């Protein structure tokens, strides 16, 4: 069989990213603690221009919005977009979302191809898929495998995860590019690999379209991703403390820590309490409730029920805006 028609449909909508960045940190034998004390003067941190360079990006719409990974563009001073046809432009960064490793770009160009979107929820483990990006800077290349698994969360790459896992060969330089189904429709943004060698060993991960679209639409509208904030640190419940409360494995979440000055604080959430229901929804898994607070919009008064002094107490908080992560990519 052949997938050249899928390649023809989607490939023109996948672009190459070249990013440059000025940096104050060099090769690590030099410029360390030893430099300034290895019989040598302080002198000056010489800031080199390093090239994140190889990446990829998907042309989401004809108006010139590009999707990609945050870790490719974070910190860039310049982003060059190179189209399959050979056109080049410098892009501007509409906005980023480090917690899902996604970025939105804009270019001013017309006669721009756009990716047909598939439906992430409709993929099944076993479906053939194709990966399109710029491995090792060799040029746009297409690789082929199958959906290995779906909804991989708990990888620990980013704080909000719903990864597709693909067999197809994904290498450094594929980040940002398209994961596409046999028809040629976008089902993911290729993001991460698990390797022992720095190159593809057949364990690759893409962000599914459903999550990507939702992030991109919020960035275009508000320049940001809007997420609910409660301000609480929470840890799981075990049988061992299931008993101590006297009422056991109701899916409890333990309020280990409450952000000082937060909306949960401001609503009288207290350290050492126990959360039974968030917004009339039972709070069992820390992930579960953390994602439910993320989707709850800021400005929404919600009810929270907590087992505190051994008796249910009913509180109310006003969900706030979630603050950015700041330093890391």
């Amino acid at each position: 069989v052949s997938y050249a028609n899928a390649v023809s449909r989607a490939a023109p909508a996948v672009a190459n990213l070249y990013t440059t960045k000025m940096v104050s940190k060099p090769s690590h034998p030099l410029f360390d603690d030893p430099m300034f004390r290895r019989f040598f003067g302080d002198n000056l941190p010489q800031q080199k221009r390093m090239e994140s360079s190889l990446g990829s990006a998907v042309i989401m719409s004809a108006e010139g919005y590009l999707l990609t990974n945050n870790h490719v563009t974070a910190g860039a001073d310049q982003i060059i977009v190179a189209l399959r046809d050979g056109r080049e432009t410098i892009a501007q960064l509409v906005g980023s979302d480090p917690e899902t490793d996604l970025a939105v770009l804009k270019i001013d160009l017309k006669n721009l191809p756009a990716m047909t979107l598939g439906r992430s929820d409709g993929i099944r483990t076993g479906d053939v898929c194709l990966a399109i990006g710029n491995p090792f800077g060799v040029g746009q290349t297409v690789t082929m495998g199958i959906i290995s698994a779906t909804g991989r969360n708990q990888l620990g790459l980013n704080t909000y995860e719903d990864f597709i896992q693909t067999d197809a060969a994904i290498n450094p330089g594929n980040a940002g590019g398209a994961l596409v189904d046999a028809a040629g429709n976008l089902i993911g943004i290729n993001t991460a690999i698990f390797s022992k060698s720095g190159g593809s060993q057949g364990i690759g991960f893409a962000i599914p379209t459903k999550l990507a679209l939702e992030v991109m639409q919020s960035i275009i509208e508000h320049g940001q991703v809007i997420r609910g904030w409660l301000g609480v640190e929470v840890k799981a419940l075990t049988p061992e403390l299931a008993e101590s409360l006297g009422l056991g494995e109701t899916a409890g979440i333990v309020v280990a820590g409450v952000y000082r000055d937060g909306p949960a604080a401001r609503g009288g959430l207290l350290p050492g309490d126990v959360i039974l229901t968030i917004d009339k929804q039972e709070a069992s898994d820390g992930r579960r409730s953390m994602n439910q607070v993320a989707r709850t919009r800021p400005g929404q008064k919600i009810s929270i029920v907590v087992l505190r002094n051994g008796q249910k107490v009913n509180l109310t908080a006003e969900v706030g805006l979630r603050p950015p992560p700041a330093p890391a990519p």
């Binding site: 609910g228 409660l230 301000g231 640190e233 929470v234 799981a236 280990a256 820390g286 953390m290 607070v293």
Partner: peptide, 7 residues
């Protein structure tokens, strides 16, 4: 063990 979620 002890792992912490934050929202």
């Amino acid at each position: 063990d002890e792992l912490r979620w934050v929202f």
